[PDB]
From Swiss-Prot, chains A, B:
It comes from Homo sapiens. Signal peptide: none annotated. Coiled coil: none annotated. Its cofactor is Mg(2+). Mg(2+) 1 binds at D90, D94. It catalyses: isopentenyl diphosphate + dimethylallyl diphosphate = (2E)-geranyl diphosphate + diphosphate; isopentenyl diphosphate + (2E)-geranyl diphosphate = (2E,6E)-farnesyl diphosphate + diphosphate. Binds 2 Mg(2+) ions per subunit. Its main location: cytoplasm. Transmembrane segments: none annotated. Dimethylallyl diphosphate binds at R99, K186, T187, Q226, K243, K252. Key enzyme in isoprenoid biosynthesis which catalyzes the formation of farnesyl diphosphate (FPP), a precursor for several classes of essential metabolites including sterols, dolichols, carotenoids, and ubiquinones. FPP also serves as substrate for protein farnesylation and geranylgeranylation. Catalyzes the sequential condensation of isopentenyl pyrophosphate with the allylic pyrophosphates, dimethylallyl pyrophosphate, and then with the resultant geranylpyrophosphate to the ultimate product farnesyl pyrophosphate. It is an enzyme of class 2 (transferase). This is Farnesyl pyrophosphate synthase. Disulfide bonds: none annotated.
Amino acid sequence: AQEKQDFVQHFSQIVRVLTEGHPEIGDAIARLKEVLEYNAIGGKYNRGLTVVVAFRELVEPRKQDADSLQRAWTVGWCVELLQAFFLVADDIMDSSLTRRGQICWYQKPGVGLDAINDANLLEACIYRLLKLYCREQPYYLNLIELFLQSSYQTEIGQTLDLLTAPQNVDLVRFTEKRYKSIVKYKTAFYSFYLPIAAAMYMAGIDGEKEHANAKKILLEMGEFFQIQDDYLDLFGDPSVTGKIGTDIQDNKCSWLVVQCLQRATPEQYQILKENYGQKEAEKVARVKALYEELDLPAVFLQYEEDSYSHIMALIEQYAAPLPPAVFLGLARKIYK
Amino acid sequence: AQEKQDFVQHFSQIVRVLTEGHPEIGDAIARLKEVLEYNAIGGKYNRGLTVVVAFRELVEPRKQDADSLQRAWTVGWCVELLQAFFLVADDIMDSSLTRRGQICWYQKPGVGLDAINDANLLEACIYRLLKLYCREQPYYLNLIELFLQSSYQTEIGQTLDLLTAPQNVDLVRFTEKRYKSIVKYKTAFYSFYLPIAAAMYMAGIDGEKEHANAKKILLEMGEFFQIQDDYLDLFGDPSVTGKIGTDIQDNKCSWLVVQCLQRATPEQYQILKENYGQKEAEKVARVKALYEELDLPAVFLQYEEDSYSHIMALIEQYAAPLPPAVFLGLARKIYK
Ligand SMILES: Cc1ccc(-c2cc3c(N[C@H](Cc4ccccc4)P(=O)(O)O)ncnc3s2)cc1
Ligand SMILES: Cc1ccc(-c2cc3c(N[C@H](Cc4ccccc4)P(=O)(O)O)ncnc3s2)cc1
Ligand SMILES: [Cl-]
Ligand SMILES: [Cl-]
């Protein structure tokens, strides 16, 4: 909330600029506006904010002029638009209903599958903003390359997930090797690496060793973030989190299920194969209870402590010559 | 067919390279292969070929080494991948059934809406190929900018079309101003301008006057191409064309309907408002017949002659200092 204020006020500009002497596309543009208003707003904006906070921590207080700052808030919003893009499109693919307690864009009367083209525009906006605000800067190409690669990392990932978890009831697919691989591609690169990485390029730090080291820390934070994300879906107090859960109820390849699958006598595979993915609550319950009887909440605690220790070693070994404050900023947030 | 041979043999490489020491994404990559094989192949490859033919016509026979040529066949394939991307995604949005006489990707058993992520990968491949083959070249950024802008031109366009023509039976929307605007954004930039424009950049011709002039010729060729595309859907002998038509049968904003709407007594608006968009053949027929009784086939002939004259004036006035052979190559094809 120290720099969240200005970030969200700058949105109104993002839209002003994306929406304008080419008269008869005017209507398409109208609709672009509606799209962004509804789909870019209403999150907690952490990823986009990471770019701003990191940019401030990374630069000479000298070279942080109004223009510099203009570009940090933008490239921050470019990340929130990348996300909206995956989110709109995944929500169609998963046949989701709500998101941020609010009806999904594609479920709205009159949108439906038009949401496909809408998502594509969310993505297109990224590269419009980069041209409008950074075409001049030494790191212009680096930012295009980054976003593009982050998109591809993410898409490869979603493909893996879909292949793993048919919305075709199968647990043989749900392995640790595979789960780590899904999380890395689908959530970790775009959620942890993209934003620090963007800030670094903006700072003129483009050595692929520096990035090699930053990615290493960040990708592991990404694993924890998701593994914690999967724990809370079930056991996390829904008021503390802000969501009912459908990890079991929707045949997801959770961390939970992966670890239960690693730790279960055949007689237990069945009770899981019997009620994982069912709509009935009676069924949703007799997995939860199996998880509880495998002390998995306790196995999570064990992983959280290890993970934590490890992030700090990685920060110790690889943050240099960046301020650890970049990493500890994130670590603080995610280890709540 | 003079240079179509090598173009289609080079595909096999395109795939070899897009699909490879990161072991557990291996499956996602498998699937990418399936995606491209099925969706990049089976067209007539005109747009991608335009890049190759234009590259040859545009360069010093000196500077056309194996490497140069390697990059022309690629950036040609980059265009065929852009198209596959719009095509897969539009075919979902339109609830289409077949395409190239062949079941659409999304209708295949096990694909469905996963086709969304599949289309996104088709698009991602463009930028992988550009990095793999051109990162070094002076025009690398120009080609990224071009493709990105061509994507956005196209998406803006599809948005306009969707807004115009709810798959909501309305003719008031179907105007000439609007039709020209749909065709320009949705089909003309990516089909005519992208490929000549790509070849020019590859040739080191990047002046925005040169491109200003090339786009002018090409966008008008784009209008004709589509306007002819809409004529043939109905009256075009389906063996000469290679498609049954559902321009009327699917409430499309055709050239036909636009011109019939411009030329019709109220008593005729009704007969159109009565049977445009109906599945029944009896209904599909009593529009066709209205079109015939408005001598629209004859109005098409009148437009084809004018259009033709005009393309040549535009070529006369704006081709320089490019070989007219670049433009007359296309004009020859499209004016069949
Ligand atoms: C780079 C980066 C850094 C921090 C975060 C955080 C997300 C988050 C958060 N998420 C919400 C959902 C959620 C995720 C994980 C745990 C609990 C709730 P949403 O996506 O509805 O804003 N909730 C509470 N604190 C945090 S911190 C994300 C990315
Ligand atoms: C830049 C550019 C230049 C020429 C073409 C052509 C397409 C085409 C063509 N299309 C087929 C469909 C069709 C379009 C227009 C008229 C008749 C058929 P498809 O997309 O199944 O390959 N058929 C016959 N000749 C041609 S020439 C496209 C782009
Ligand atoms: Cl400046
Ligand atoms: Cl070379």
